Design a protein around this nucleic acid. Structure first.
Ligand SMILES: C[S@@+](CC[C@H](N)C(=O)[O-])C[C@H]1O[C@@H](n2cnc3c(N)ncnc32)[C@H](O)[C@@H]1O
Ligand SMILES: [Zn+2]
Ligand SMILES: [Zn+2]
Length: 817
DNA sequence: GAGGCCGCCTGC
DNA sequence: GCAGGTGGCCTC
């Protein structure tokens, strides 16, 4: 029944290989694709490519199976084409008796004319390779075979094993107890003697060291003791050392145990590690270090990455140009003597790519574009922004850009009809003009704050996400990026995410998604954003950027669950990072005091920048004028509320005194009196009730009798506090040591994002402070009235986040050609 | 316009 | 129960 065709191509040990085999009437040859029924009779048939044919001297006839992945087993789920397969790095040796039948599969390669094929509207096929852990679709690898029975899955899995393994390279000196090496490699990184290493913060240590409840009634609602926006739980950044030795223990017979590579390093001091502790970091550059003579031995396996640590004085080009011209760059100018707690001089032995033409849809004032420009990858030649103030802001910052103040649907319809100019006379971009496409579609529908998201949008075919995908389909850019709020990935059981990826895959794009935390790229703000990246067939698909700054772990939940499958990005820095966290102090301690209602558009800074972050954002060129440090003019009642929020960390509306106050209005803030009784809540030391509405008990209803107006404690917050976590953070002050909550379009102290009060002044954060929280340069122009400006800032992608993404795209530009 | 008011889901 | 969400809508 089963008989081999020919003789044995190769003969190993127990296994005897062949080239082609014959089962019944069919005949299978290395390369043919086959199907297999599951070990559980229920599931569908599996599909695989035959890699090898052989029989071993104990068990039966065998073959090597390189499995395909069905479309539904990917993140696409049931939105996948039923006939589409995906290449995966999964394979196994199997007995020929499992083969059910031969199967035809076609490779659907993109056309040589793929970039021009957009805008025009029964067999298994594959076009892309899928990574099941990172939800990445990429162009099939070009691993070439010397490999007769060649399995590409085996080839890549072996490459991947030799990459992860710590190996020593060039020897050096054989000592009594160990062998020294000059270099070693790990995760594809070359480490040499004298290189800098990132080490986990526990790798080595340094040789250095009841309220009055009548007056504040709502204070009991702070029993949680959890402080929003606080930096007590953020991890320490990496330890940094200089490789002094790379050595392996020698066995008793003298041969080196190359399974157990160790390194000896010199310890570097961050300022906050010296005796001066945390305040030393306030003014210091985030990449400043101090040399030390302290040494430590650690396992090579503990190295988290390589970095450059240079003596600053010997550098050609200045410290700033050095620090801006590359990743993982640190410097030192002095050494730190721990025993003497002093700073001596360091000992002697311590010594042409053209930019992508970019189209920015829903451009806003230009945060994404600014970030991409800083990364050096793009010129935003075209922007589409329907709202006139933001389009004006974009024009101010981008003079050689063509900014369309048009509905993006209208403008695409004109291009597809063959139009050359819009109604203003502006030249429309055509196929081949657009090489990168980026945009942040409106997020009001996807935001979890939106209580009414079913009223005026429930059709995916007509959403602005689909409009944006139509731009991608039409212009076929080299790179594509879509940004939105985190909830974009789980909205409607993740169908918007699945249909977006499905659409890109149908175009032939490599694509992927992930969630990023802006605070991990250098703003004092928690801001989780979903990012869809795509790359044309001839390109490399970018990776998501590794975190640069440590950040509070609660704010860094970046996993996404799609149909029970949990998905993560490529990011490996999970517990630490090269740079300290950016704080509210870093962000705005240099700004002069202003009042509630501050309207002076151009004032004096009254002093030089104080922190590294302020130095970066204010720029090299001296700036004589501080712009847009203006605040909304809150009413007399709200202003009185703010004046009564304590300055201590964690202060919000729950700390308000229950008093009458005379407002600047001449009017009078009234006292809140606790009428009803909440058995779930109780009563105070005084025995006074804690309810303010007939809703607090049973299944009753709201009546206007118990609703109190003009109260210093806002009535609506005790009214519904039991089901809203006591409205923590409403009228909440920022903390100097902490970070901003997500910066939205209009900072309201009674909004869901209510922690908008200045740490000390009795006002809402200014437009400049919100811009600082978003990482905008101080010279970055906004436009319109103050609410226009707040919206421009709150809508934007933080430029430091966009810059991190942009440098990942730059690596792909350099790796292609 | 400005302030008050305040649902539901993912994730734990 | 706890924590988070580039906010909408309603009334004056
Ligand atoms: C959330 S903002 C994105 C801002 C930008 N990503 C940044 O970093 O500054 C989205 C913008 O799209 C604009 N917009 C809304 N509908 C539009 C449409 N149909 N066509 C063009 N722009 C639109 C809005 O005015 C808004 O400014
Ligand atoms: Zn294999
Ligand atoms: Zn009620």
């Amino acid at each position: 029944r089963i008989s081999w065709v020919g003789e044995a191509v190769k003969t190993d040990g127990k296994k005897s290989y062949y080239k082609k085999v014959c089962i019944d009437a069919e005949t299978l040859e290395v390369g043919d694709c086959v199907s297999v029924i599951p070990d559980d009779s229920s599931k569908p048939l599996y599909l695989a490519r035959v890699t090898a044919l052989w029989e071993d001297s104990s068990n039966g006839q065998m073959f090597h199976a390189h499995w395909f992945c069905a479309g539904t087993d990917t993140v696409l789920g049931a939105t996948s084409d039923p006939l589409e397969l995906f290449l995966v790095d999964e394979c196994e040796d199997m007995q020929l008796s499992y083969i059910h039948s031969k199967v035809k599969v076609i490779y659907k390669a993109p056309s040589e004319n793929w970039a021009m094929e957009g805008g025009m509207d029964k067999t298994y096929f594959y076009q892309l390779w899928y990574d099941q852990d990172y939800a990445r679709f990429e162009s099939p690898p070009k691993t070439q075979p010397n490999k007769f029975k060649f399995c590409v899955s085996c080839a890549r899995l072996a490459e991947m094993r030799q990459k992860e393994i710590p190996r020593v390279l060039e020897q050096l000196e054989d000592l009594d107890s160990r062998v020294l090496y000059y270099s070693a490699t790990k995760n594809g990184i070359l480490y040499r003697v004298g290189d800098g290493v990132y080490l986990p913060p526990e790798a080595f240590t340094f040789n250095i060291k009841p309220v009055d409840e009548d007056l504040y009634p709502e204070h009991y609602r702070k029993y949680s003791d959890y402080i929003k926006g606080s930096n007590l739980d953020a991890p320490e950044p990496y330890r940094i050392g200089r490789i002094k030795e790379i050595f392996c223990p020698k066995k008793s017979n003298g041969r080196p145990n190359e399974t157990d590579i160790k390194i000896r390093v010199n310890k570097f001091y961050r300022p906050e590690n010296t005796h001066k502790s945390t305040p030393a970091s306030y003014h210091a550059d985030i990449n400043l270090l101090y040399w030390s003579d302290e040494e430590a031995v650690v396992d090579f396996k503990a190295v988290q990455g390589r970095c450059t640590v240079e003596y600053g004085e010997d550098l050609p080009e200045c410290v700033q140009v050095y620090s801006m011209g590359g990743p993982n760059r640190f410097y030192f100018l002095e050494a730190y003597n721990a025993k003497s707690k002093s700073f001596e001089d360091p000992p002697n032995h311590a010594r042409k790519l053209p930019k992508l033409r970019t189209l920015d849809v829903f451009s806003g004032c230009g945060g994404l574009s600014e970030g991409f420009h800083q990364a050096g990858i793009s010129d935003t030649l075209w922007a589409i922004e329907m709202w006139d103030p933001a389009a004006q802001a974009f024009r101010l910052n981008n003079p050689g850009s063509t900014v369309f103040t048009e509905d993006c649907n209208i403008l695409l319809k004109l291009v597809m009809a063959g139009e050359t100019t819009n109604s203003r006379g502006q030249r429309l971009p055509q196929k081949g003009d657009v090489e990168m496409l980026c945009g942040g579609p409106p997020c009001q529908g996807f935001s979890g704050m939106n209580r009414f998201n079913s009223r005026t949008y429930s059709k995916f075919k007509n959403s602005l996400v689909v409009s944006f995908l139509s731009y991608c389909d039409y212009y076929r850019p080299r790179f594509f990026l879509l940004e939105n709020v985190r909830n974009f990935v789980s909205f409607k059981r993740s169908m918007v995410l699945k249909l977006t990826l499905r659409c890109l895959v149908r175009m032939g794009y490599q694509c992927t998604f992930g969630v990023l935390q802006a605070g991990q790229y250098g703003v004092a703000q928690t801001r989780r954003r979903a990012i869809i990246l795509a790359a044309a067939p001839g390109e490399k698909l970018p990776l998501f950027p590794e975190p640069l700054h440590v950040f509070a772990p609660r704010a860094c939940q970046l996993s996404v669950v799609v149909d029970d499958k949990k998905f993560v990005s490529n990011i490996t820095r999970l517990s630490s990072g090269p740079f300290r966290t950016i704080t509210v102090r870093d962000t705005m301690s240099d700004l002069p005091e202003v009042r509630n209602g501050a309207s002076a558009l151009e004032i004096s800074y009254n002093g030089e920048p104080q922190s590294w972050f302020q130095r970066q954002l204010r720029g090299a060129q001296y700036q004589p004028i501080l712009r847009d440090h203006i605040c909304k003019d809150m009413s007399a009642l709200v202003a009185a509320r703010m004046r009564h929020i304590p300055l201590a960390p964690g202060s919000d509306w729950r700390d308000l005194p229950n008093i009458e106050v005379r407002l600047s209005d001449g009017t009078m803030a009234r006292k809140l009196r606790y009428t009803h009784h909440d058995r779930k809540n109780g009563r105070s030391s005084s025995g006074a009730l804690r309810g303010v509405c007939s809703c607090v008990e049973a299944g009753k209803a709201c009546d206007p009798a118990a609703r109190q107006f003009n109260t210093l404690i806002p009535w609506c917050l005790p009214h519904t506090g039991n089901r809203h976590n006591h409205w923590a953070g409403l009228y909440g002050r920022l903390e100097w040591d902490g970070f901003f909550s997500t910066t939205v379009t209009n900072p309201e102290p009674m909004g869901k994002q209510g922690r908008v009060l200045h740490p000390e002044q009795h006002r809402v954060v200014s437009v400049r402070e919100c811009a600082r929280s978003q990482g905008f340069p101080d010279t970055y122009r906004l436009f319109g009235n103050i609410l226009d400006k707040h919206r421009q800032v709150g809508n934007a992608v933080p430029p430091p986040l966009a810059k991190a993404i942009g440098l990942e795209i730059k690596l792909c530009m350099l790796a292609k050609a």
